[model samples]
Target: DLRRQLRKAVMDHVSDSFLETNVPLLVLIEAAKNGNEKEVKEYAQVFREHANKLIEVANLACSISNNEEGVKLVRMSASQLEALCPQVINAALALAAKPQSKLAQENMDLFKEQWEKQVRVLTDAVDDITSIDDFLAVSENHILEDVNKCVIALQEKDVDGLDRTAGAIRGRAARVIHVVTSEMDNYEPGVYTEKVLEATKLLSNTVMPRFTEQVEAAVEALSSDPAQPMDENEFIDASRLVYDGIRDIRKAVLM
Candidate 1:
């Protein structure tokens, strides 16, 4: 019975992370499609690092359960990846919104592609599901919904609605980041092993701050411009930029 409960815990958490990671990636993809290179790259950076953390978390969860070399190299890679990803995300966001900046659109595209590939690699690393399900369960599904709403707000150019949706999007991501980070700290060794938990906590601590900043900025933009109606094209362009950024970030973290 304890095993069943534990497996459920891990499974729920992994599945939750999987879906949470997808929200930003999907948003970034849609944003890129709309020609918003700036926001695309910005969100991509966040998505990548956060995705990577999730993969590391999943690996650690497996280790806690004593799953075999199902995911070797985790110990080495997880620590190596603890390079303050929040800074990268902040830099990307700053670059995206720069006034008449010389930053090329292609640069953003390259970033998106790089991180996406990395996230894909991370996904491939986790093949054993039963073991994960045995650990975590029922994470959360609100992030995706928030992303979808943001898309609508952008497509319609409803500044008011965009503001509202964007705020929700930021909050959702914040919750996910917090949950993952805090959970890692509390994870016990009997199930997830000390090393695995430490790895997750290490990576998450470096990544969440940036995401939190991102969420705050997004909310700020929305709150500051509730009255003016932004052009649909402009909104689309800006949103696509952030959207692509988000997708690339997801891939980066996954890798």
Candidate 2:
């Protein structure tokens, strides 16, 4: 249980780091594209800080991990990322210094690709270290919270919030499906394992599509000029189905 908590802490940090950095990097890219050197310089500092945070949390993950092989891989990958962070920041600086230079833009693009690739390596290695059940359990709760937020956003007619919250729910579902499927593959066929897989299939096939459909409809209605009327009943019904689906999965797995 303690290790599960540790794994959850590491996963949360890593996930948050990636999400937090994403917008700043995109803003930096846009600033560079627009030749806004001042903004680029500003965003460079933010990007640098973001990089450092990832490195720090990655090392933190390594410190808590007991799998000797997993620790070594994480440390190695984090070190590579630490080395690359400065280079990526330097590239951003160069772009800021020569905002008009096509070469600088290309260089920044290259570093961005390289940085993302290394992060993926680190993330995958981190995933290897964490327990699957712990990940799924946490993800399940997060999805539930986001689903509730989605309903609330729809009620308030907050289109952006609805879309954003729904997108998060979608991402969590995808992660759950990917990780749980990979986890089940490691075990031999059994009632327990098969039940888990069945839950995954239900989420992927029935629940997600219905939820997405409802979200899309709500977004469209809320975004229209004059605000088109949405089928609130339909949306509420779909949301209920998602909660029901989740409950069914939990029963299959735990009870």
In Å, residue 64's CA in model 1 sits off its true spot by 2.4
Q: For residues 1-255, could you state the per-residue lDDT of candidate 1 as single tens digits?
A: 454455456554344644345567556655555556676786676676566667556565565444345445443333333342343344345444552344534444455565555444444344343333212222123444555666676555445665676666555444444434443443454544444444444334533344344434444555564533334444434444333333333332233
**Model 2 agreement with the true structure over 200-230: per-residue lDDT tens digits:** 7888898889989999999998989989987
Give Cα-based local distance difference scores for all models: 0.47, 0.77
The prediction achieving the highest lDDT against the true structure is 2
Clashing residue pairs in candidate 2, if any? none
Poorest stretch of ten by lDDT in candidate 1: 131-140
Query: How high a TM-score does candidate 1 get?
Result: 0.34
TM-score of predicted structure 2: 0.50
C-alpha displacement of 101 in model 1, angstroms? 6.2
